[PDB]
Ligand binder design. Structure first.
Ligand SMILES: Cc1cn(-c2cccc3cc(C(=N)N)sc23)nc1N
Ligand SMILES: Cc1cn(-c2cccc3cc(C(=N)N)sc23)nc1N
Ligand SMILES: [Cl-]
Ligand SMILES: [Cl-]
Ligand SMILES: [Mg+2]
Ligand SMILES: [Mg+2]
Ligand SMILES: [Mg+2]
Ligand SMILES: [Mg+2]
Lengths: 235, 8, 235, 8
Protein backbone atom coordinates (compact mmCIF):
# COMPACT_ATOMS: atom_id res chain seq x y z
CA UNK A 1 0.00 0.00 0.00
CA UNK A 2 1.81 3.06 -1.32
CA UNK A 3 -0.20 5.33 0.99
CA UNK A 4 0.91 3.60 4.17
CA UNK A 5 3.14 6.51 5.20
CA UNK A 6 0.51 9.29 4.76
CA UNK A 7 -1.81 10.35 7.59
CA UNK A 8 -5.45 9.30 7.20
CA UNK A 9 -6.57 12.93 7.45
CA UNK A 10 -4.06 13.95 4.75
CA UNK A 11 -5.33 11.23 2.39
CA UNK A 12 -8.89 12.49 2.82
CA UNK A 13 -7.84 16.12 2.27
CA UNK A 14 -5.92 15.12 -0.88
CA UNK A 15 -8.89 13.09 -2.12
CA UNK A 16 -11.00 16.25 -1.93
CA UNK A 17 -8.30 18.26 -3.76
CA UNK A 18 -8.04 15.57 -6.46
CA UNK A 19 -11.81 15.73 -6.93
CA UNK A 20 -11.57 19.50 -7.46
CA UNK A 21 -8.76 18.94 -9.97
CA UNK A 22 -10.71 16.15 -11.73
CA UNK A 23 -7.84 13.76 -10.97
CA UNK A 24 -10.02 10.75 -10.27
CA UNK A 25 -7.31 8.08 -10.43
CA UNK A 26 -5.42 9.98 -7.73
CA UNK A 27 -8.64 10.47 -5.78
CA UNK A 28 -9.30 6.71 -5.85
CA UNK A 29 -5.76 5.88 -4.72
CA UNK A 30 -6.03 8.37 -1.81
CA UNK A 31 -9.38 6.90 -0.71
CA UNK A 32 -8.04 3.33 -1.02
CA UNK A 33 -5.19 4.42 1.24
CA UNK A 34 -7.70 5.89 3.71
CA UNK A 35 -9.73 2.65 3.76
CA UNK A 36 -6.55 0.62 4.39
CA UNK A 37 -5.96 2.59 7.60
CA UNK A 38 -8.56 0.20 9.03
CA UNK A 39 -11.03 2.71 10.47
CA UNK A 40 -14.68 2.88 9.39
CA UNK A 41 -15.61 5.65 6.93
CA UNK A 42 -17.91 8.55 7.65
CA UNK A 43 -20.81 9.41 5.34
CA UNK A 44 -18.75 12.05 3.46
CA UNK A 45 -15.81 9.63 3.20
CA UNK A 46 -18.01 6.83 1.81
CA UNK A 47 -19.21 9.22 -0.85
CA UNK A 48 -15.63 10.27 -1.71
CA UNK A 49 -14.72 6.60 -2.16
CA UNK A 50 -17.71 5.96 -4.40
CA UNK A 51 -17.31 9.10 -6.52
CA UNK A 52 -13.63 8.37 -7.16
CA UNK A 53 -14.03 4.79 -8.33
CA UNK A 54 -17.25 5.55 -10.23
CA UNK A 55 -15.37 8.07 -12.32
CA UNK A 56 -12.41 5.74 -12.88
CA UNK A 57 -14.49 2.72 -13.89
CA UNK A 58 -16.78 5.01 -15.88
CA UNK A 59 -13.97 6.01 -18.23
CA UNK A 60 -13.03 2.35 -18.62
CA UNK A 61 -16.60 1.26 -19.37
CA UNK A 62 -17.00 4.00 -21.98
CA UNK A 63 -13.70 3.00 -23.62
CA UNK A 64 -14.59 -0.70 -23.52
CA UNK A 65 -17.91 -0.04 -25.24
CA UNK A 66 -16.22 1.96 -28.00
CA UNK A 67 -13.71 -0.84 -28.64
CA UNK A 68 -16.25 -3.67 -28.35
CA UNK A 69 -18.37 -1.90 -30.97
CA UNK A 70 -15.41 -1.55 -33.34
CA UNK A 71 -14.53 -5.19 -32.71
CA UNK A 72 -18.03 -6.35 -33.63
CA UNK A 73 -18.12 -4.31 -36.84
CA UNK A 74 -14.78 -5.87 -37.84
CA UNK A 75 -16.45 -9.29 -37.51
CA UNK A 76 -19.60 -8.54 -39.53
CA UNK A 77 -20.25 -10.32 -42.82
CA UNK A 78 -18.20 -8.31 -45.32
CA UNK A 79 -15.53 -6.76 -43.07
CA UNK A 80 -11.85 -6.55 -43.96
CA UNK A 81 -9.77 -8.51 -41.45
CA UNK A 82 -7.72 -5.92 -39.54
CA UNK A 83 -5.65 -8.38 -37.54
CA UNK A 84 -5.61 -8.94 -33.80
CA UNK A 85 -5.18 -5.33 -32.68
CA UNK A 86 -8.79 -4.36 -31.87
CA UNK A 87 -9.36 -7.55 -29.88
CA UNK A 88 -5.98 -7.20 -28.18
CA UNK A 89 -6.66 -3.62 -27.12
CA UNK A 90 -10.24 -4.33 -26.02
CA UNK A 91 -8.78 -7.14 -23.89
CA UNK A 92 -6.26 -4.69 -22.41
CA UNK A 93 -8.94 -2.20 -21.37
CA UNK A 94 -11.16 -5.08 -20.18
CA UNK A 95 -8.39 -6.40 -17.94
CA UNK A 96 -7.75 -2.94 -16.44
CA UNK A 97 -11.48 -2.52 -15.78
CA UNK A 98 -11.65 -5.93 -14.10
CA UNK A 99 -8.67 -4.94 -11.99
CA UNK A 100 -10.41 -1.82 -10.71
CA UNK A 101 -13.61 -3.72 -9.94
CA UNK A 102 -11.53 -6.34 -8.13
CA UNK A 103 -9.79 -3.59 -6.10
CA UNK A 104 -13.12 -2.08 -5.03
CA UNK A 105 -14.64 -5.48 -4.20
CA UNK A 106 -11.52 -6.27 -2.18
CA UNK A 107 -11.91 -3.14 -0.07
CA UNK A 108 -15.59 -3.92 0.50
CA UNK A 109 -14.72 -7.48 1.57
CA UNK A 110 -11.57 -6.42 3.55
CA UNK A 111 -13.19 -5.06 5.64
CA UNK A 112 -15.76 -2.29 4.98
CA UNK A 113 -18.87 -4.49 4.83
CA UNK A 114 -18.17 -6.70 7.85
CA UNK A 115 -17.53 -3.66 10.09
CA UNK A 116 -20.62 -1.81 8.75
CA UNK A 117 -23.41 -2.16 11.30
CA UNK A 118 -25.50 0.92 10.71
CA UNK A 119 -28.05 0.62 7.96
CA UNK A 120 -26.79 3.70 6.07
CA UNK A 121 -23.27 2.30 5.82
CA UNK A 122 -24.20 -1.34 5.27
CA UNK A 123 -26.69 -0.57 2.49
CA UNK A 124 -24.22 1.84 0.90
CA UNK A 125 -21.45 -0.77 0.75
CA UNK A 126 -23.73 -3.61 -0.42
CA UNK A 127 -25.04 -1.37 -3.21
CA UNK A 128 -21.41 -0.75 -4.22
CA UNK A 129 -20.74 -4.51 -4.24
CA UNK A 130 -23.77 -4.99 -6.52
CA UNK A 131 -22.58 -2.17 -8.80
CA UNK A 132 -19.02 -3.46 -9.25
CA UNK A 133 -20.17 -7.04 -9.90
CA UNK A 134 -22.59 -5.51 -12.41
CA UNK A 135 -19.71 -3.76 -14.19
CA UNK A 136 -17.87 -7.07 -14.23
CA UNK A 137 -20.99 -8.74 -15.67
CA UNK A 138 -21.12 -6.18 -18.51
CA UNK A 139 -17.85 -7.61 -19.91
CA UNK A 140 -18.15 -11.26 -18.83
CA UNK A 141 -19.20 -14.18 -21.02
CA UNK A 142 -19.28 -17.63 -19.36
CA UNK A 143 -18.96 -17.36 -15.60
CA UNK A 144 -21.14 -14.36 -16.39
CA UNK A 145 -23.84 -16.37 -14.62
CA UNK A 146 -21.88 -16.54 -11.38
CA UNK A 147 -21.00 -12.83 -11.52
CA UNK A 148 -24.65 -11.94 -12.19
CA UNK A 149 -25.77 -13.94 -9.17
CA UNK A 150 -23.13 -12.23 -6.99
CA UNK A 151 -24.50 -8.84 -8.10
CA UNK A 152 -28.09 -9.97 -7.49
CA UNK A 153 -27.25 -11.30 -4.03
CA UNK A 154 -25.56 -8.08 -2.95
CA UNK A 155 -28.35 -5.89 -4.29
CA UNK A 156 -31.03 -8.09 -2.69
CA UNK A 157 -29.42 -7.97 0.75
CA UNK A 158 -29.13 -4.20 0.44
CA UNK A 159 -32.78 -3.97 -0.61
CA UNK A 160 -33.96 -6.06 2.35
CA UNK A 161 -32.08 -3.86 4.85
CA UNK A 162 -33.16 -0.61 3.17
CA UNK A 163 -36.83 -1.54 3.22
CA UNK A 164 -36.68 -2.40 6.93
CA UNK A 165 -34.46 0.47 8.09
CA UNK A 166 -34.81 3.48 5.76
CA UNK A 167 -37.71 5.66 4.58
CA UNK A 168 -38.78 5.31 0.95
CA UNK A 169 -37.27 8.70 0.11
CA UNK A 170 -33.85 7.97 1.56
CA UNK A 171 -31.40 8.80 -1.30
CA UNK A 172 -29.28 5.69 -0.66
CA UNK A 173 -32.39 3.51 -0.82
CA UNK A 174 -33.54 5.30 -3.98
CA UNK A 175 -30.16 5.00 -5.75
CA UNK A 176 -29.97 1.34 -4.80
CA UNK A 177 -33.40 0.71 -6.31
CA UNK A 178 -32.52 2.65 -9.48
CA UNK A 179 -29.36 0.59 -9.99
CA UNK A 180 -30.96 -2.77 -9.11
CA UNK A 181 -33.73 -1.99 -11.62
CA UNK A 182 -31.13 -1.32 -14.31
CA UNK A 183 -29.45 -4.59 -13.29
CA UNK A 184 -32.75 -6.37 -13.88
CA UNK A 185 -33.28 -4.71 -17.25
CA UNK A 186 -29.77 -4.79 -18.81
CA UNK A 187 -27.99 -7.67 -17.08
CA UNK A 188 -30.57 -10.21 -15.89
CA UNK A 189 -32.86 -9.87 -18.94
CA UNK A 190 -35.85 -9.25 -16.65
CA UNK A 191 -37.38 -6.05 -18.05
CA UNK A 192 -40.68 -6.69 -16.27
CA UNK A 193 -38.94 -6.92 -12.89
CA UNK A 194 -37.02 -3.74 -13.74
CA UNK A 195 -40.21 -1.81 -14.57
CA UNK A 196 -42.08 -3.12 -11.52
CA UNK A 197 -39.27 -2.14 -9.14
CA UNK A 198 -38.88 1.33 -10.68
CA UNK A 199 -42.64 2.03 -10.52
CA UNK A 200 -43.09 0.77 -6.97
CA UNK A 201 -39.99 2.68 -5.83
CA UNK A 202 -41.21 5.89 -7.43
CA UNK A 203 -44.77 5.64 -6.07
CA UNK A 204 -43.71 4.88 -2.51
CA UNK A 205 -41.23 7.77 -2.49
CA UNK A 206 -43.87 10.17 -3.88
CA UNK A 207 -46.07 9.26 -0.91
CA UNK A 208 -43.26 10.03 1.59
CA UNK A 209 -42.15 13.41 0.19
CA UNK A 210 -44.53 15.17 2.55
CA UNK A 211 -42.20 14.35 5.46
CA UNK A 212 -39.08 16.00 4.01
CA UNK A 213 -37.42 19.36 4.43
CA UNK A 214 -36.72 21.51 1.39
CA UNK A 215 -33.15 20.13 1.33
CA UNK A 216 -34.20 16.47 1.63
CA UNK A 217 -37.00 16.96 -0.94
CA UNK A 218 -34.49 18.19 -3.52
CA UNK A 219 -32.20 15.21 -2.85
CA UNK A 220 -34.93 12.56 -3.19
CA UNK A 221 -36.71 14.07 -6.20
CA UNK A 222 -33.40 14.13 -8.10
CA UNK A 223 -33.11 10.33 -8.08
CA UNK A 224 -36.84 9.87 -8.60
CA UNK A 225 -36.43 11.73 -11.88
CA UNK A 226 -33.87 9.14 -12.96
CA UNK A 227 -36.37 6.34 -12.20
CA UNK A 228 -38.92 8.23 -14.29
CA UNK A 229 -36.39 8.75 -17.13
CA UNK A 230 -35.80 4.99 -17.28
CA UNK A 231 -39.50 4.10 -17.11
CA UNK A 232 -40.06 6.41 -20.09
CA UNK A 233 -37.44 4.52 -22.08
CA UNK A 234 -38.86 1.17 -20.98
CA UNK A 235 -42.64 1.65 -21.45
CA UNK B 1 -27.02 3.49 -21.34
CA UNK B 2 -29.94 3.76 -18.91
CA UNK B 3 -29.63 6.10 -15.94
CA UNK B 4 -27.86 4.79 -12.85
CA UNK B 5 -26.91 6.57 -9.57
CA UNK B 6 -24.04 9.09 -9.25
CA UNK B 7 -21.49 10.42 -11.60
CA UNK B 8 -21.80 9.96 -15.37
CA UNK C 1 10.52 0.67 -23.86
CA UNK C 2 7.49 -1.45 -23.06
CA UNK C 3 6.34 -1.32 -26.69
CA UNK C 4 9.51 -2.85 -28.07
CA UNK C 5 7.78 -6.14 -28.89
CA UNK C 6 4.81 -4.64 -30.80
CA UNK C 7 4.92 -4.01 -34.56
CA UNK C 8 5.14 -0.36 -35.60
CA UNK C 9 1.95 -0.70 -37.66
CA UNK C 10 0.12 -2.24 -34.67
CA UNK C 11 1.18 0.64 -32.40
CA UNK C 12 -0.20 3.15 -34.90
CA UNK C 13 -3.46 1.21 -35.28
CA UNK C 14 -3.83 1.03 -31.48
CA UNK C 15 -3.07 4.74 -31.17
CA UNK C 16 -6.02 5.45 -33.48
CA UNK C 17 -8.26 3.09 -31.46
CA UNK C 18 -7.18 4.75 -28.20
CA UNK C 19 -8.06 8.14 -29.68
CA UNK C 20 -11.55 6.85 -30.52
CA UNK C 21 -11.87 5.52 -26.97
CA UNK C 22 -10.57 8.79 -25.47
CA UNK C 23 -7.73 6.83 -23.84
CA UNK C 24 -5.08 9.48 -24.34
CA UNK C 25 -2.47 8.09 -21.94
CA UNK C 26 -2.57 4.82 -23.90
CA UNK C 27 -2.50 6.75 -27.17
CA UNK C 28 0.63 8.61 -26.06
CA UNK C 29 2.38 5.41 -24.97
CA UNK C 30 1.56 3.75 -28.33
CA UNK C 31 2.91 6.74 -30.28
CA UNK C 32 6.05 6.90 -28.09
CA UNK C 33 6.56 3.23 -28.94
CA UNK C 34 6.13 4.01 -32.64
CA UNK C 35 8.68 6.86 -32.47
CA UNK C 36 11.18 4.55 -30.73
CA UNK C 37 11.09 2.20 -33.72
CA UNK C 38 13.49 4.74 -35.24
CA UNK C 39 11.66 5.52 -38.48
CA UNK C 40 10.49 9.02 -39.42
CA UNK C 41 6.78 9.79 -38.91
CA UNK C 42 4.29 10.55 -41.64
CA UNK C 43 2.05 13.62 -41.48
CA UNK C 44 -0.86 11.62 -39.96
CA UNK C 45 1.51 9.98 -37.47
CA UNK C 46 2.98 13.34 -36.39
CA UNK C 47 -0.52 14.54 -35.70
CA UNK C 48 -1.36 11.40 -33.69
CA UNK C 49 1.74 12.01 -31.56
CA UNK C 50 0.82 15.64 -30.96
CA UNK C 51 -2.86 15.00 -30.21
CA UNK C 52 -2.03 12.29 -27.68
CA UNK C 53 0.47 14.26 -25.64
CA UNK C 54 -1.55 17.50 -25.93
CA UNK C 55 -4.47 15.77 -24.28
CA UNK C 56 -2.31 14.20 -21.57
CA UNK C 57 -0.45 17.39 -20.66
CA UNK C 58 -3.71 19.33 -20.99
CA UNK C 59 -5.31 17.41 -18.13
CA UNK C 60 -2.19 17.97 -16.04
CA UNK C 61 -2.09 21.71 -16.74
CA UNK C 62 -5.77 22.08 -15.85
CA UNK C 63 -5.23 20.16 -12.60
CA UNK C 64 -2.09 22.14 -11.76
CA UNK C 65 -3.94 25.42 -12.20
CA UNK C 66 -6.76 24.29 -9.92
CA UNK C 67 -4.29 23.29 -7.19
CA UNK C 68 -2.05 26.34 -7.60
CA UNK C 69 -5.12 28.54 -7.16
CA UNK C 70 -6.16 26.71 -3.98
CA UNK C 71 -2.57 26.95 -2.74
CA UNK C 72 -2.49 30.71 -3.25
CA UNK C 73 -5.80 31.27 -1.47
CA UNK C 74 -4.47 29.26 1.49
CA UNK C 75 -1.56 31.75 1.68
CA UNK C 76 -3.62 34.96 1.52
CA UNK C 77 -3.73 37.33 4.49
CA UNK C 78 -6.39 35.77 6.73
CA UNK C 79 -6.29 32.12 5.64
CA UNK C 80 -6.40 29.18 8.03
CA UNK C 81 -3.21 27.12 7.73
CA UNK C 82 -4.27 23.77 6.24
CA UNK C 83 -0.89 22.07 6.52
CA UNK C 84 1.39 20.87 3.75
CA UNK C 85 -1.15 18.87 1.75
CA UNK C 86 -2.11 21.38 -0.97
CA UNK C 87 1.54 22.23 -1.68
CA UNK C 88 2.50 18.56 -1.55
CA UNK C 89 -0.19 17.55 -4.03
CA UNK C 90 0.46 20.50 -6.36
CA UNK C 91 4.12 19.40 -6.34
CA UNK C 92 3.04 15.85 -7.22
CA UNK C 93 1.01 16.96 -10.23
CA UNK C 94 3.77 19.42 -11.19
CA UNK C 95 6.37 16.64 -11.18
CA UNK C 96 4.17 14.38 -13.34
CA UNK C 97 3.60 17.23 -15.80
CA UNK C 98 7.34 17.92 -15.98
CA UNK C 99 7.91 14.23 -16.61
CA UNK C 100 5.56 14.22 -19.60
CA UNK C 101 7.14 17.37 -21.05
CA UNK C 102 10.56 15.78 -20.55
CA UNK C 103 9.38 12.61 -22.35
CA UNK C 104 8.13 14.60 -25.33
CA UNK C 105 11.26 16.76 -25.49
CA UNK C 106 13.34 13.58 -25.32
CA UNK C 107 11.58 12.10 -28.34
CA UNK C 108 12.02 15.35 -30.27
CA UNK C 109 15.74 15.41 -29.41
CA UNK C 110 16.20 11.59 -29.89
CA UNK C 111 15.79 11.78 -32.82
CA UNK C 112 12.72 13.32 -34.53
CA UNK C 113 14.13 16.81 -35.09
CA UNK C 114 17.59 15.85 -36.37
CA UNK C 115 16.11 13.45 -38.96
CA UNK C 116 13.44 16.00 -40.04
CA UNK C 117 14.58 17.60 -43.28
CA UNK C 118 11.33 18.60 -44.93
CA UNK C 119 9.93 21.92 -43.83
CA UNK C 120 6.53 20.47 -42.85
CA UNK C 121 8.11 17.98 -40.46
CA UNK C 122 10.88 20.21 -39.13
CA UNK C 123 8.55 23.13 -38.38
CA UNK C 124 6.03 20.75 -36.80
CA UNK C 125 8.60 19.28 -34.42
CA UNK C 126 10.20 22.64 -33.53
CA UNK C 127 6.75 24.04 -32.74
CA UNK C 128 6.22 21.05 -30.42
CA UNK C 129 9.57 21.75 -28.73
CA UNK C 130 8.48 25.36 -28.17
CA UNK C 131 5.10 24.21 -26.81
CA UNK C 132 6.50 21.72 -24.27
CA UNK C 133 9.14 24.16 -23.00
CA UNK C 134 6.29 26.66 -22.71
CA UNK C 135 4.31 24.22 -20.54
CA UNK C 136 7.42 23.76 -18.43
CA UNK C 137 7.75 27.55 -18.16
CA UNK C 138 4.16 27.84 -16.88
CA UNK C 139 5.18 25.99 -13.68
CA UNK C 140 8.82 27.08 -13.36
CA UNK C 141 10.17 29.78 -11.04
CA UNK C 142 13.94 30.41 -11.15
CA UNK C 143 15.54 28.67 -14.11
CA UNK C 144 12.26 29.84 -15.60
CA UNK C 145 14.49 32.22 -17.58
CA UNK C 146 16.45 29.39 -19.18
CA UNK C 147 13.28 27.43 -19.99
CA UNK C 148 11.68 30.54 -21.53
CA UNK C 149 14.71 31.09 -23.75
CA UNK C 150 14.63 27.42 -24.86
CA UNK C 151 10.97 27.87 -25.85
CA UNK C 152 11.75 31.15 -27.64
CA UNK C 153 14.67 29.61 -29.51
CA UNK C 154 12.62 26.66 -30.76
CA UNK C 155 9.69 28.83 -31.81
CA UNK C 156 12.00 31.31 -33.56
CA UNK C 157 13.76 28.63 -35.59
CA UNK C 158 10.37 27.21 -36.58
CA UNK C 159 9.18 30.69 -37.57
CA UNK C 160 12.24 31.34 -39.74
CA UNK C 161 11.78 28.06 -41.64
CA UNK C 162 8.01 28.51 -41.99
CA UNK C 163 8.34 31.99 -43.45
CA UNK C 164 10.88 30.80 -46.03
CA UNK C 165 9.25 27.48 -46.94
CA UNK C 166 5.47 27.62 -46.34
CA UNK C 167 2.61 29.83 -47.58
CA UNK C 168 1.04 32.20 -45.05
CA UNK C 169 -2.09 30.05 -44.90
CA UNK C 170 -0.30 26.80 -44.16
CA UNK C 171 -2.05 25.43 -41.01
CA UNK C 172 1.25 24.41 -39.37
CA UNK C 173 2.63 27.91 -39.94
CA UNK C 174 -0.58 29.45 -38.60
CA UNK C 175 -0.70 27.26 -35.47
CA UNK C 176 2.96 27.99 -34.81
CA UNK C 177 2.31 31.73 -35.01
CA UNK C 178 -0.77 31.46 -32.76
CA UNK C 179 1.21 29.60 -30.09
CA UNK C 180 4.33 31.80 -30.34
CA UNK C 181 2.08 34.85 -29.94
CA UNK C 182 0.56 33.35 -26.78
CA UNK C 183 4.13 32.63 -25.61
CA UNK C 184 4.93 36.31 -26.06
CA UNK C 185 1.81 37.43 -24.22
CA UNK C 186 1.62 34.99 -21.27
CA UNK C 187 5.19 33.78 -20.76
CA UNK C 188 7.60 36.44 -22.02
CA UNK C 189 5.54 39.42 -20.80
CA UNK C 190 5.68 40.98 -24.28
CA UNK C 191 2.03 41.74 -25.06
CA UNK C 192 2.98 44.16 -27.82
CA UNK C 193 5.03 41.51 -29.61
CA UNK C 194 2.13 39.07 -29.17
CA UNK C 195 -0.38 41.49 -30.73
CA UNK C 196 1.96 42.44 -33.59
CA UNK C 197 2.62 38.81 -34.50
CA UNK C 198 -1.06 37.86 -34.35
CA UNK C 199 -2.11 40.83 -36.53
CA UNK C 200 0.62 40.36 -39.12
CA UNK C 201 -0.08 36.61 -39.26
CA UNK C 202 -3.80 37.16 -39.73
CA UNK C 203 -3.42 39.84 -42.42
CA UNK C 204 -0.91 37.88 -44.49
CA UNK C 205 -3.07 34.75 -44.37
CA UNK C 206 -6.18 36.74 -45.39
CA UNK C 207 -4.28 37.87 -48.49
CA UNK C 208 -3.36 34.26 -49.43
CA UNK C 209 -6.82 32.66 -49.00
CA UNK C 210 -7.54 33.28 -52.67
CA UNK C 211 -5.12 30.47 -53.59
CA UNK C 212 -6.82 27.74 -51.54
CA UNK C 213 -9.31 25.01 -52.31
CA UNK C 214 -12.53 24.78 -50.32
CA UNK C 215 -10.86 22.17 -48.07
CA UNK C 216 -7.69 24.21 -47.48
CA UNK C 217 -9.73 27.41 -46.94
CA UNK C 218 -11.68 25.76 -44.12
CA UNK C 219 -8.46 24.53 -42.48
CA UNK C 220 -6.70 27.92 -42.55
CA UNK C 221 -9.69 30.05 -41.53
CA UNK C 222 -10.19 27.84 -38.46
CA UNK C 223 -6.84 28.87 -36.96
CA UNK C 224 -7.21 32.45 -38.16
CA UNK C 225 -10.33 32.67 -36.01
CA UNK C 226 -8.24 31.71 -32.98
CA UNK C 227 -5.80 34.54 -33.76
CA UNK C 228 -8.78 36.88 -33.99
CA UNK C 229 -10.24 35.55 -30.71
CA UNK C 230 -6.97 36.36 -28.94
CA UNK C 231 -6.62 39.81 -30.51
CA UNK C 232 -10.13 40.60 -29.24
CA UNK C 233 -9.08 39.69 -25.70
CA UNK C 234 -5.84 41.65 -26.05
CA UNK C 235 -7.00 44.94 -27.65
CA UNK D 1 -6.40 30.72 -20.95
CA UNK D 2 -5.88 32.28 -24.39
CA UNK D 3 -6.44 30.14 -27.47
CA UNK D 4 -3.59 27.92 -28.62
CA UNK D 5 -3.44 25.30 -31.43
CA UNK D 6 -5.08 21.84 -31.24
CA UNK D 7 -7.01 20.03 -28.63
CA UNK D 8 -8.45 21.84 -25.59
C1 LIG E 1 -22.28 13.73 5.51
C2 LIG E 1 -22.03 14.06 4.04
C3 LIG E 1 -22.56 13.41 2.93
N1 LIG E 1 -22.10 14.01 1.86
C4 LIG E 1 -22.42 13.65 0.60
C5 LIG E 1 -23.68 13.08 0.34
C6 LIG E 1 -24.04 12.72 -0.94
C7 LIG E 1 -23.09 12.92 -2.01
C8 LIG E 1 -21.81 13.49 -1.73
C9 LIG E 1 -20.80 13.72 -2.68
C10 LIG E 1 -19.60 14.30 -2.20
C11 LIG E 1 -18.37 14.66 -3.06
N2 LIG E 1 -18.49 14.48 -4.52
N3 LIG E 1 -17.35 15.11 -2.57
S1 LIG E 1 -19.80 14.53 -0.51
C12 LIG E 1 -21.46 13.86 -0.45
N4 LIG E 1 -21.26 15.03 2.24
C13 LIG E 1 -21.22 15.07 3.56
N5 LIG E 1 -20.47 15.99 4.38
C1 LIG F 1 -1.82 13.38 -43.89
C2 LIG F 1 -2.78 13.58 -42.72
C3 LIG F 1 -2.82 14.66 -41.85
N1 LIG F 1 -3.78 14.45 -40.99
C4 LIG F 1 -4.12 15.30 -40.01
C5 LIG F 1 -3.93 16.69 -40.19
C6 LIG F 1 -4.27 17.59 -39.21
C7 LIG F 1 -4.82 17.09 -37.97
C8 LIG F 1 -5.01 15.68 -37.80
C9 LIG F 1 -5.52 15.08 -36.64
C10 LIG F 1 -5.64 13.66 -36.66
C11 LIG F 1 -6.19 12.79 -35.51
N2 LIG F 1 -6.74 13.48 -34.34
N3 LIG F 1 -6.20 11.57 -35.58
S1 LIG F 1 -5.05 13.15 -38.19
C12 LIG F 1 -4.67 14.79 -38.78
N4 LIG F 1 -4.38 13.24 -41.27
C13 LIG F 1 -3.78 12.71 -42.32
N5 LIG F 1 -4.08 11.45 -42.95
CL1 LIG G 1 -2.85 -3.77 -26.53
CL1 LIG H 1 0.74 14.08 -2.62
MG1 LIG I 1 -10.89 -10.79 -21.07
MG1 LIG J 1 -45.47 -7.12 -19.82
MG1 LIG K 1 8.34 21.44 -8.27
MG1 LIG L 1 1.00 49.77 -27.11
Amino acid sequence: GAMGSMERASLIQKAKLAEQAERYEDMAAFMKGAVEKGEELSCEERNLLSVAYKNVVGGQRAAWRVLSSIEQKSNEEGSEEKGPEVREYREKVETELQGVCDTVLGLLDSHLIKEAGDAESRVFYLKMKGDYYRYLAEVATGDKKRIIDSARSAYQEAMDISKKEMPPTNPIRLGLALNFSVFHYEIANSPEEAISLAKTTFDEAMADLHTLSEDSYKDSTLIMQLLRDNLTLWT
Amino acid sequence: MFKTEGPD
